[PDB]
């Protein structure tokens, strides 16, 4: 075939019912995740090729960066609750991996303040039970699907993208192949 199990995707031997359609995992500590966001714009190009009425979900993970990794998963919960993903993603990435100015929860908070979220509103979100369950959601979904590596994308809780089995000479070709693969898996 042109798309083969084990080549551009693997299949979960234990499928995850009730899963979000397109589910993506990342960590602000994850170097390929940085590329995926800043250089490749994977999420965005996948979206552009998906049907619509297709929900796209992105979650942070705990297993990188110890204590700060968990702070970042709670911070990403705040970002999702406030709808400000598109305003903090880049400075969180650069703060962790480029400038290395994020070392504490307070430094994470600074990024949100600078992006214009109000102090009171951030701290209230940070401490809210809506955010707590949004942290639990991120953890449960990672737990449902065996997750030991990022970046990772799952489609309908059954198919996992396998970018190792795609071409990397051309960055644009890689992205298109990746997005086309998600679309193919989507209509499966």
């Amino acid at each position: 075939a042109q798309y083969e199990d084990g080549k551009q995707y693997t299949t979960l031997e234990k499928p995850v019912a009730g899963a979000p359609q397109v589910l993506e995992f990342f960590s602000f500590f994850c170097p390929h995740c940085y590329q995926f966001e800043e250089v490749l714009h994977i999420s965005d190009n996948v979206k552009k090729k998906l049907p619509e009425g297709v929900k796209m979900t992105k979650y942070h993970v705990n297993f990188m960066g110890g204590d700060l990794g968990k702070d970042l998963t709670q911070a990403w919960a705040v970002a999702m609750a406030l709808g400000v993903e598109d305003k903090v993603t880049v400075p969180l990435f650069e703060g962790v991996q480029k400038t290395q100015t994020i070392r504490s929860a307070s430094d994470i908070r600074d990024v949100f303040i600078n992006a214009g979220i109000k102090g009171e509103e951030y701290d209230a979100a940070w401490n809210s039970f809506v955010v707590k369950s949004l942290v639990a959601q991120q953890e449960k979904a990672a737990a449902d699907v065996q997750l030991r590596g990022v970046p990772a994308m799952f489609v309908n809780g059954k198919y996992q993208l396998n970018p190792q089995g795609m071409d990397t000479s051309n960055m644009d070709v890689f992205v298109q192949q990746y997005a086309d693969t998600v679309k193919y898996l989507s209509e499966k």
Side-chain angles (χ1 to χ4, degrees), residues 5-37:
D5 191 323
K7 194 43 202 186
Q8 302 106 312
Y9 66 100
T10 54
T11 309
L12 293 176
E13 59 180 60
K14 175 141 175 298
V16 177
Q21 297 158 272
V22 174
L23 179 62
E24 202 172 330
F25 290 101
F26 80 108
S27 166
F28 286 109
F29 280 96
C30 161
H32 284 144
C33 302
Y34 189 109
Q35 296 295 307
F36 263 43
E37 165 66 27

Side-chain angles (χ1 to χ4, degrees), residues 127-143:
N127 284 303
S128 71
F129 285 72
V130 176
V131 152
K132 290 196 188 309
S133 60
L134 216 40
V135 165
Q137 281 168 232
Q138 293 181 96
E139 296 183 20
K140 180 185 174 292

Side-chain angles (χ1 to χ4, degrees), residues 28 68 70-82 84 88 92 102 104-129 131:
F28 286 109
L68 249 192
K70 283 207 73 158
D71 277 326
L72 284 165
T73 301
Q74 196 170 346
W76 186 246
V78 179
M80 290 189 289
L82 298 181
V84 293
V88 294
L92 287 169
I102 295 175
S104 69
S106 176
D107 296 337
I108 298 177
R109 185 177 184 272
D110 286 343
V111 170
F112 284 74
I113 301 286
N114 187 42
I117 292 84
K118 285 164 208 170
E120 176 38 45
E121 192 184 7
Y122 181 86
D123 301 343
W126 181 270
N127 284 303
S128 71
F129 285 72
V131 152

Side-chain angles (χ1 to χ4, degrees), residues 20-24 42-57 153-156 161 175-188:
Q21 297 158 272
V22 174
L23 179 62
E24 202 172 330
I42 293 289
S43 293
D44 191 68
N45 279 283
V46 168
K47 169 117 149 178
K48 296 196 171 349
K49 292 225 163 150
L50 289 187
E52 335 176 33
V54 184
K55 164 171 197 43
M56 206 144 171
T57 308
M153 187 181 287
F154 295 87
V155 180
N156 295 310
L161 277 283
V175 176
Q176 291 328 315
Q177 176 170 8
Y178 195 100
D180 289 342
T181 301
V182 174
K183 183 179 178 294
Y184 159 80
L185 289 178
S186 188
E187 296 149 1
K188 221 176 165 80

